[PDB]
Paper text:
RSV F is a class I fusion protein that is initially synthesized as an inactive precursor. To facilitate virus entry, the mature F protein is triggered to undergo a transition from a metastable prefusion conformation to a stable postfusion conformation, resulting in fusion of the viral and host-cell membranes. Here we characterize AM14, a potent RSV neutralizing antibody that was previously isolated from human PBMCs, and show that it recognizes a novel quaternary epitope on the native trimeric prefusion conformation of RSV F. The epitope is evenly distributed across two protomers, causing AM14 to be uniquely trimer-specific and, surprisingly, cleavage-dependent.
Residue numbers in the entry:
A (entry chain J): 1 to 35, 35A, 35B, 36 to 82, 82A, 82B, 82C, 83 to 100, ...
B (entry chain D): 2 to 52, 52A, 53 to 82, 82A, 82B, 82C, 83 to 100, 100A, ...
C (entry chain C): 26 to 97, 137 to 513
D (entry chain B): 76 to 97, 137 to 252
E (entry chain B): 302 to 401
F (entry chain E): 1 to 95, 95A, 96 to 212
G (entry chain L): 1 to 27, 29 to 212
Write the structure that this text describes.
Amino acid sequence: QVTLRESGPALVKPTQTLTLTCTFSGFSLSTAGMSVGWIRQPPGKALEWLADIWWDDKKHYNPSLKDRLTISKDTSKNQVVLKVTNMDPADTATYYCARDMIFNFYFDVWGQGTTVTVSSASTKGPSVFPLAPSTAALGCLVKDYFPEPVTVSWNSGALTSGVHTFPAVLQSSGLYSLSSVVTVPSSSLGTQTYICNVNHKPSNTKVDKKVEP
Amino acid sequence: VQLVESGGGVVQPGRSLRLSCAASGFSFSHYAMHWVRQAPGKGLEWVAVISYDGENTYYADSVKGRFSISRDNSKNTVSLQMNSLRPEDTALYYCARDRIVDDYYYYGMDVWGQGATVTVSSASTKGPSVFPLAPSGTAALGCLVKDYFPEPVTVSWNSGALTSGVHTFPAVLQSSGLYSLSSVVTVPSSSLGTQTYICNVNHKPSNTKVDKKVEP
Amino acid sequence: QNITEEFYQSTCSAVSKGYLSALRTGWYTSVITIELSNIKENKCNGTDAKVKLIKQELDKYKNAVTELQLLMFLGFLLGVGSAIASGVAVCKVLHLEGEVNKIKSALLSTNKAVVSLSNGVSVLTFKVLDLKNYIDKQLLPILNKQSCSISNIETVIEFQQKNNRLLEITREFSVNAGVTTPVSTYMLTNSELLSLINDMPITNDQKKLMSNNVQIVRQQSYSIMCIIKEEVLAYVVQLPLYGVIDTPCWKLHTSPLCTTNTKEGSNICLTRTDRGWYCDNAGSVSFFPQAETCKVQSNRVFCDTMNSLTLPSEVNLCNVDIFNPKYDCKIMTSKTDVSSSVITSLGAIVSCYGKTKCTASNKNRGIIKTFSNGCDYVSNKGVDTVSVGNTLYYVNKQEGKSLYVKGEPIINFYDPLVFPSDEFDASISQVNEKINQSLAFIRKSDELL
Amino acid sequence: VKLIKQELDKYKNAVTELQLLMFLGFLLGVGSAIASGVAVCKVLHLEGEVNKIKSALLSTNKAVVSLSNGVSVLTFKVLDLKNYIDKQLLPILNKQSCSISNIETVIEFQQKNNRLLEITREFSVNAGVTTPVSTYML
Amino acid sequence: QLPLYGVIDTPCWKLHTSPLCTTNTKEGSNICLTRTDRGWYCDNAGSVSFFPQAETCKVQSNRVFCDTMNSLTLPSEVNLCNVDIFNPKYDCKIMTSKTD
Amino acid sequence: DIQMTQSPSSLSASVGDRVTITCQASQDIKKYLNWYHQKPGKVPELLMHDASNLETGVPSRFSGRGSGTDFTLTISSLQPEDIGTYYCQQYDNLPPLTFGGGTKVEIKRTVAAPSVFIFPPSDEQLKSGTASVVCLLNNFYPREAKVQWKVDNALQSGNSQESVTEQDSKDSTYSLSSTLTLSKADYEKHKVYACEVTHQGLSSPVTKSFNRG
Amino acid sequence: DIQMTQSPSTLSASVGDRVTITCSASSRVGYMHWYQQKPGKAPKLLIYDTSKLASGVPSRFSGSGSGTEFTLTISSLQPDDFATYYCFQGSGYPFTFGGGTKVEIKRTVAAPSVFIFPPSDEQLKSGTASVVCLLNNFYPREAKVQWKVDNALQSGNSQESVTEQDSKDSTYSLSSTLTLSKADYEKHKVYACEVTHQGLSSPVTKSFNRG
């Protein structure tokens, strides 16, 4: 079966050049009719075609991000490489690599992907501010951290129902933030004590906070 | 190469019931499809046919105007709609594939589903009670399956592991209007006391499922 | 479940409207080159089986080179053209001074390049086989002079393998006076061909069309032997350019329609003569009279615009209402009451006349319908075979719905004896006037008397 | 080995091309010459119909098989490249060391493979329909 | 796809035709005449299958190979056209011209 | 509507016997006839079409003959797995396709005397106020047998039901059950229960009995 | 460059209801191609050559169309069909994708539970004040959050994150974070959150007085 796989740094600083290595098997890029293409998907946005290349070394590029694209191949290592200059955080997205054929101008086989992050921000510690109560809802807020991912458990995973961890939202400081919340019986306040523990592996920080009125 | 029916069960006379047939393993949209029915202990009766493209349909005279056959080639599905059912409609209903492709003539059937049981009746549903037929160099043992309605019941031995020497007699109608049968097995007598024999009786219409061990 | 068909009883004809067009509108000319090795002279004495075989094969190589050196109804309205006029034109240019050298120069480093020739036309060029490097560098220096001992026999196999492609090419041109069609694999391999397709300035869809149907492209292509000047063999492959794609197409089937009065002769016949393929392409309709020129791959219909007339879109009205005042529908008339059948795309039209046995049969049940003297139609679904007299027609087994359009056969409106019956490419209005003329002459000639 | 490799590419290229393919007189009327032949072809495009025929032809090279249309058809396995390639060729090409002993193996493979190549060639230049039927074909 | 030959060993005959014109001394002013039913004829079901284009028929001495799909099936009275062209039983097909 | 008549309704023959069943149509159906075999408890199997053309995998011992209105199915070497019911069906022109009434074919193993067993009612059933005594006749031929119940040596009538199986697909016998049903009160008012069997395989009637307790 | 539009951009349907997706393009094209994508997983090819079924794809799916108008149809909307669907074309460069069609399940309704959280005291010490507004267990996804401070509208100083549809009750939850400097926070008295949703007969307002 054809299988493709993406590789490339997960993080890259703005203006730097982004290099990507797509490797594959199941088919030779040298065989007549064969092609490999690059396609990207910004967060919560539609898919965008980027570039492709054929066995006869024909190259094509999308005018929108032109002239920032460079594509090349090496049938020897069964891999294709694409370069993007002058990165912008607009480009933060998940990219896929996929095969193409002249017999059929569509992408039949797809890499599981690699994603890339663009920011000057890098390592950091986050600040848990807990949302106090006053059916009852309470939650913890994780402010000012980078990068993703970060996660939340309650009581160390004893409390799971009622809980809703929110997809983190980017701020303009370039940092990430998120709030999660558990609803609970109103009568269990003051006797039942809620604890939310955040695990920030990228900066090796496990903060336990006690949530109380 | 597989056909699975569904939708069988009890329906009060005058009321309606819909059967469905799911197909797999062959080029479904290229075969005419038939329905055939068989009342317990009786012969085969052709019921209806639909052409491979669904343009033409034909029905048995005994169900004309009351039954309607249809198909969905996009879902590999055949259905049989049965309206204003009579007690004489009680039977096992088979889904079956025509043997010939893309034809407006109809021929025999070479692939048959296992069938769905449909019972049309004013009698109430009742589950069976299972009694042991105790043994006292070959011994016979068994199970008495008494007082049930409607047909059919299934009986197996050792969850299907025991099939040799098994005789499951046809149901008898009692003056009470309920059915009853017995199932008996002959096993080597040296096996009694050591090998476990338990009769598995299933009566689908009453949701009754009883496993009963038979001892000397 | 794409393609459909309609039969018109009124005009004894049928139209299939599920087709898509594939028109060749133009030509693209590419130059294929083979760098050849000149030889003079293998001089190995002593006949050793290993020596004789290489020599014999080299003799085969030289003779090929030498041979090449040595080479230097309706339808009548379509007019004539020169299929290879485009290709011959390219060949002519190649006969110029060091033009060979210009192209021989660009292809030294890569096997693919566009060279602008002095005509000014830019042409894709291909060096697919370099026997020269192998022959001049591996073979030739060992052979000269007197002692030649060739060891490792796998070498003579390699040379025969390499040389073989050249031999089939020299063979084909030899039996085709230097123009071959269709273009064989030996002349241009599939990889070479697919590579050729990608640099042609057509739509990504047009490339797509050609690549799934390479076998069709070959039949509409020409290979033209040009020159062997310098040390290079050069021939031009002429490929079709399909400027018209995905426009609705339809095929018209017709058959003789006659009255079925009981007498022996005294009958009048009628037949629509505008049969063939029709396609929408530039607001008009391209009509292909000879439907041999059109190849079918289910959804796609491949035609050559050279054998066509460009007709007004009003031509479709002849299928629905033949008496429309907007277009004079082309027909023919006859007293020839002869039974025949016409197999359509999704069925068969049966023109049954006289005492002739006309029947339709299924493979399983046998005869299922006996026709009653006239023009009828039967679907492909419930019928597998048709027999008209002693001749048996097989019916097409595709999928698709057909529609029987009932209507009184048109031939019944005319009184015999006043009917013009010897008309080959006439028309409705052209018939009416002769009847009118004959209606005037019959009607005026008694008024006076 | 390179020669075998080249021939095996030829074997494959042949395979690839096939995969890719998927006075008076005017009174006589028209018919479809291959309507009969085309009809069979169509039937063969169904599920494990191929498998049905592949089953009957494993032991003998000749058997009559009834297809789901109902038509019984004479079947012939005239060339078993599979067996030659799997039993003669494949164990030799994959000897860890790409040795090859003697040349008769490449001659033998070119000889057997040759017939398929002419057939793939004719179909290639005939859009999958040839007439007359050549010796290579039968 | 192989041919199945249902009609074998029935008598066959081939009709050759040629232009017939008056040979009056004048320059043009001549009238010509030609039988148009040239081709192969064969007995097959009490009738005669007629193959107009005899290009379509292959010959091996005794055996005449034709394809019935490119044929018309005619009544046995066609033989009268060879013996008496003015017979009341069959209207023999011809063509006329001034082309001498 | 075309009528299909099959004969006989049932027949008896020995293993290895040649067995012929007949089908008659109410009108000319040429050879548009199918044959089916239905083993007990199983779905029908198509044996042949066009009156005589066997399906692939169908044993060679089956052959069909006939045309018009009269047809025969012949088994040249009757095998144990051939039991059940055989059905003819027409598909001449228009539907309804119609089946024959079916022909049950039974296999004869030479006259065979029944093995007799008796089962007292269970203790669990006695709690219900009902006592069922079961008499089993196992693996006998021919079908004909007289089974008589005796309670305290007195012949019983009107208080028993019999059930007989279709013939077995392996050893060519029938089995028979005879059930004596009494109220708990009548059953315990007697001591000994016996079923007496008379059959062609037994020189004299065989009696099996038990005493309560 | 050609540009693709796609409708409905959002659609929801009950199991078994027919589903129709229409694609519109600025220029005529040969074929329309279709892709299925689950969240975060690489996209899969569904339909090719406008109507041809790809391998692994259910006959439940089908394609149709020509020129600039093409449609995708799911004969009977099954749970495993939950995804975003994109129209694609390789007919002319640059290649484009659909605006994108998101499918779920029609219909379901839920009114939001609304809560409000003043900034924590630990945070008020760091020099920042975050007020959080919470809408719990609602549907449809459409909901308007309006923040008021001493009755004035706030713009550009709020962020809104919403929750994944739940595998149990199929509702969404949303969070709205108003971010101010500590200074600005203590400069005002009342903080209010006004919610507008289809399940609400009249705008609900949760609020608090600072301290």
